[PDB]
Design a protein around this nucleic acid. Structure first.
Ligand code: 1GC
Ligand code: MG
Ligand code: MG
Ligand code: NA
Ligand code: NA
Length: 326
DNA sequence: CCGACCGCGCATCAGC
DNA sequence: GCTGATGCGC
DNA sequence: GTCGG
């Protein structure tokens, strides 16, 4: 990682605009620029060299100049002194508290972790679990645990039916040696884009993962999506593993390829692929890649039998999971 | 200039 | 109760 | 904040 200083600074700036300014376009601008800079294999030596990058414009470039000259931006160091902004930033780091609730709590005089662990009657279920596992959720998962976690889920799924197919995606499918969480894609033949043949098809999986105590908390559940907590088992007098965010996404089997494409990401990569789908005359979601007419008409689902079928439509040579860590 | 800047599932609230 | 907008997350 | 047209 060649320009950690610059990319860090942009991530700070991005977080501030999102959490404190509630300026979601400025946030996505910083996030893009942080991404392209994070991928560029020269060590940036001036703001001018960095303005040659796309998504880096003038205001970023002058920030990049001030930061190599001094190791800092005073904008950020002011943001770091201001008690109210700092407190907001900090509360967003609890899962389920975003910019709106972070500022509400700070206006209510709730600004630190103690205050939360005392006004829980003001937290909803998600925020409650979030603070409960606050330290754990800040920790990364070494890939070796991801593999450990992978065996449990995939084998517990064949127990409910051997026609379930599960594919870990997220940063694990991109090849990271550490992940924020585990993201799991769920396929069954009896749930095409049409027949809801067997209901509770995703509840089946979840409940079985709860029997064997792999899943231990729930942030949200639905026919298509489960956000919860999981924990690896440990040996005698072996200390416990940290509790981990787990996401499970059930998707029609005949739309699998747009499922993995969505779920391996990254999130920025999907924004750039989907924005480029739009320039080429298509729209892409988790389910389909559709044509557009000059009239805002989301056209008719187009046939894909490979991930690369998606790329060819928008005229992209295939990028391997390792290369979409944008 | 300035319009666009990804697309969706779930929880919760307001309003009726 | 539903519907529609909003927060928050993937 | 940055970009295409
Ligand atoms: N289109 C789109 N896809 C997204 C978005 N956010 C996530 N995804 C897709 C792509 C994303 O890869 C996947 C899971 O998102 P996470 O688990 O939150 C982040 P991951 O990439 O796994 O990295 P980690 O921090 O966990 O190490 O859903 C989004 O905003 N938009
Ligand atoms: Mg992930
Ligand atoms: Mg996830
Ligand atoms: Na530029
Ligand atoms: Na949060």
């Amino acid at each position: 990682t060649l320009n950690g200083g610059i990319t860090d600074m942009l991530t700070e700036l991005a977080n501030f605009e999102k959490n404190v300014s509630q300026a979601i376009h400025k946030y996505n601008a910083y996030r893009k620029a942080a991404s392209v800079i994070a991928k560029y294999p020269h060590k940036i030596k001036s703001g001018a060299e960095a303005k040659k990058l796309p998504g880096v414009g003038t205001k970023i470039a002058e920030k990049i100049d001030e930061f190599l000259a001094t190791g800092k931006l005073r904008k950020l160091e002011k943001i770091r002194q201001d008690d109210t902004s700092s407190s907001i930033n900090f509360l967003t780091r609890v899962s389920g508290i975003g910019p709106s609730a972070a500022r509400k709590f700070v206006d209510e005089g709730i600004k630190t972790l103690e205050d939360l662990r005392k006004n829980e009657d003001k937290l909803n279920h998600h925020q409650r679990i979030g603070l409960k596992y606050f330290g754990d959720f800040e920790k990364r998962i070494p890939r070796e645990e991801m593999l450990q976690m992978q065996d449990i889920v995939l084998n517990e799924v064949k127990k409910v039916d051997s026609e379930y197919i599960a594919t870990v995606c997220g940063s694990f499918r991109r090849g990271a040696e550490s992940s924020g969480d585990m993201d799991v894609l769920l396929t069954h033949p009896s749930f095409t884009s049409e027949s809801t043949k067997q209901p509770k098809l995703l509840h089946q999986v979840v409940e079985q993962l709860q029997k064997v105590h792999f899943i231990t908390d729930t942030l949200s559940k639905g026919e298509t999506k489960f956000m919860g907590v999981c924990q690896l088992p440990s040996k005698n007098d072996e200390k416990e593993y940290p509790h981990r965010r787990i996401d499970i996404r059930l998707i029609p089997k005949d739309q699998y390829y747009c499922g993995v494409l969505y779920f391996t990401g990254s999130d920025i990569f999907n924004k750039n692929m989907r924005a480029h789908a739009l320039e080429k005359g298509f729209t892409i979601n988790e389910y389909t890649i559709r044509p557009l007419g000059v009239t805002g008409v989301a056209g008719e689902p187009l046939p894909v039998d490979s991930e690369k079928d998606i790329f060819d439509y928008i005229q992209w040579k295939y990028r391997e999971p390792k290369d979409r860590s944008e």
